[model samples]
Target chain A: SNAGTLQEYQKRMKKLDQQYRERIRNAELFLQLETEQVERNYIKEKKAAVKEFEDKKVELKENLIAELEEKKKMIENEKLTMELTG
Target chain B: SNAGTLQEYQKRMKKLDQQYRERIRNAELFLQLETEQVERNYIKEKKAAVKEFEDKKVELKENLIAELEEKKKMIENEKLTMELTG
Candidate 1:
């Protein structure tokens, strides 16, 4: 009978239905938590590295500028001496 | 003759070299920070999602188990009653 067929289908489907529900529900929740934790750690580490790089950049810039100023002064002094001699 | 040309070339080249060096240095620093930030964000988000999914999985498992247990008990009771009545 169609009733028997329907009943068998429903019985089999019940197990499958429960399994699917459990899998989907758990997978979604787990993924959500995992994503958040990864993002938090990534931001924290990146900020620290960026700050370190920035400090180095500033220090190097200052040194470069100082060196350039000294070079300019030296070049000027040499030009003045040559002009006086020639 | 060529001495003057060479001297001018050398001066120009020195300036260009300095400019390139500074540009490369700064660009590298900025790029490093940018890359790290992007990775960090991605990882953090991924981790969070995963954790959330895990929690959900646990909750759903518990619920499913409970439901299954209740169904099993009902089936057992029904079987006992039928056996006794028949």
Candidate 2:
């Protein structure tokens, strides 16, 4: 039965692992895509077409910081949950 | 001219911004998927399929911390690049 058996969990856990592996790979791809975006931003603004780059630069800086904080919170929560489960 | 003009940069910058916004959205979605995965892990192990949870627990935990470190490095480098460009 699927009710709290080690075999069942083994299957579910492997599936979750595969699923997250895909997810983390997706994140990796995003970082790759964004590296290009950042590179383009660098070139476009670095060339002096920077009429408004300073403002957007500051805005993106702050937003990334906020995103990092949110990311940490999520990771921390997951670690605690893992502790309980273990 | 298309070479280093304010209008060209405006267009490119907007496109870069849109691209990154999508990347960030995808990250948020992954976090959502992972939260569910963590919850499933909790339920499965808590119910007694925890035969191997301890080992995998340590494994996933370390992997995540390593992930956080790598993630920080990317953000740090990007911030530096942003500063230089701005």
Candidate 3:
């Protein structure tokens, strides 16, 4: 009789242990997923920001070059006019 | 005798339940802390990158402005020299 009761207790305890293990496993999986998502988002945002800055930098440099070229042309025209009249 | 065995099993099961609950609590707390740290790191990194980009952009703009101003002065000097000689 006592042996039967002890066996029953062991069965129930084993089931409870399994349930707890599954729950813990699920929790760990969920946390891992969250961490991966966060890292991916960070990388994507950083890449976009870097590309935007590079594009703007290139545009600004081109603009300055264009403006300087225009000024150079103006000076050349002035020199040519002076040569013709003087 | 059977009753004594059943009582002991009940007591032991209660203690096991408490232990499993405590383990789950600790696991959850650890995950939360990890998540918070990850978020903090992301924010810090993003802020630093943005600031670096901003500083570079400002420096580039200033350089362009300075170059343009110097060109303007050169043009003014040339015009003054022409007026004085002509």
Candidate 4:
């Protein structure tokens, strides 16, 4: 039982090697697919975040410009009042 | 430039393929190492967390038993006092 035959040992090792070869291949393929998916998700999230930031930037700039315009109008009115009073 | 010889095209394609194959292999090996490291770290963290939880559980049980022992002692004293008065 312990020694067995040389051919028997070879056969067992061959079977084990085949099993591991297939299993390792499957694991490699699974890892590749998962990596690809993770990279795709990262890219997608990055794009979305960038777009959100851009939109927020535009909104902030618009608000700043609008406030400046309002201040200009107020200043113009004050100048007109002074001219009339003078 | 537009249409190189067929053999030149084949040679360029073969070179490109070889470069990609080696690069892809390197990436795969890197990912495998990273995955192995991540798995090891996860196992270590899990073991630590479980050990901490076990320690907490033991502490809680010890406290509970100690409190019960104290209550028993108090009750025994009270019983003795009643016996002496009666």
Candidate 5:
């Protein structure tokens, strides 16, 4: 009878251990997925912001170049007139 | 003899329970530290990237303003020429 009872207790413990293992595994998987999602969102936002700043830089550069070209034309006209007079 | 065996089983179960608790706590702490370190690294990288972009923006703005001022001077010269020639 003593041996029989000990066997029963062991079976119960095995069942409880299996349940605990499943619970822990599920919890770990949930946390891992959450962490991945947070990282993906962070990277996406950072890339978008960087792209915005890059586009602004390109636009500013184009505008500056066009303005410089216009100023160069005007300076050339002035130089031509100065040569004719002096 | 059966009673003695049951008592032994109870004591063993109590010890196992404590062990499980300690294991779970250690696992939780490990996961928390891992997640925090990853997040800190991500934020640090993002901040550095943004700071670099900001510095580029400031430089672009300064250059743009200077170019605009030079173009304005050229436009003023053209206006003066029109006034004198007309």
Candidate 6:
């Protein structure tokens, strides 16, 4: 905190890094909501769950991309506000 | 920075997220520095780079752990200062 030279972009970038990683971690859970229908590399079971899983993954990925855009805008706004004040 | 009610914890978390991910991304580069001579799934080449890569990986891992500790301390200290003032 003593090093007041820390700029607004640094703070925003921290948030960007933090949140982008969060989205990445959450991607696995949504992917789990999917199961392999055709390309069963590991297990051939859960054939019923495969199509639903694939559907859910695509849906979730779309939402995730939208959320990311919102966050990116917020980060940009933070930078703009900082500049305006300074 | 205000919304003045924004507490120190939230800020620290942003930084924590930022740095932990930074370390994670860097880990890949360092891993690349330590290619496998044996467990070659991706590339069986770079046999000459194996021992040196292994050595660099070990050394770099140690340094990374140490750096994480320092960053963790900084995050904690930020929390402490907020507590002291409040």
TM-score of only chain B in every candidate structure: 0.49, 0.45, 0.54, 0.54, 0.46, 0.38
Residue range A1-86, candidate 6, lDDT tens digits: 42432354356445545654565455444343332321242233333335444565566556556766676788899999999999
Question: Would you estimate the TM-scores of all the predictions?
Answer: 0.34, 0.27, 0.35, 0.36, 0.31, 0.22
How do the candidates rank by lDDT, highest first? 1, 3, 5, 4, 2, 6
DockQ (C-alpha based) per candidate is: 0.04, 0.01, 0.02, 0.01, 0.01, 0.02
Candidate 1, which segments miss by more than 4 Å at Cα? A1-11, A65-69, A72-80, B1-86
Report the CAPRI category for model 3: incorrect
Q: Pick the candidate with the highest DockQ.
A: 1
lDDT of 5 by residue, B1-86 (tens): 24554465556556555655565555556556768876666566556555654665566556556766776788789999999999
For the predicted complex of model 4, DockQ is 0.01
Lowest summed lDDT window (length 10), candidate 3 chain B: B1-10
lDDT of 5: 0.62
Better of 1 and 4 by lDDT: 1
Clash pairs (backbone) in predicted model 6: A34-A53
Angstrom error at residue B31, model 3: 15
* Candidate 5 clashes between residue pairs 3 or more apart in a chain or in different chains: none
Candidate 6 on B1-86: residue-level lDDT in tens? 32322344346445555655565555444444433311242232233334444565566556556766677789899999999999
| CA lDDT, every model vs. true structure | 0.63, 0.59, 0.62, 0.60, 0.62, 0.51
Worst 10 residues of 4 chain A by lDDT: A1-10
Residue A8 lDDT in model 5?
Answer: 53
- Model 3, which residues run further than 4 Å from truth? A1-17, A71-86, B1-34, B37-86
lDDT of 5 by residue, A5-64 (tens): 446555655655565556555555665676886666555655655565466556655655
Clashes of each: 37, 0, 0, 0, 0, 1
Candidate 3 vs 5: which has more DockQ: 3
TM-score of 2: 0.27
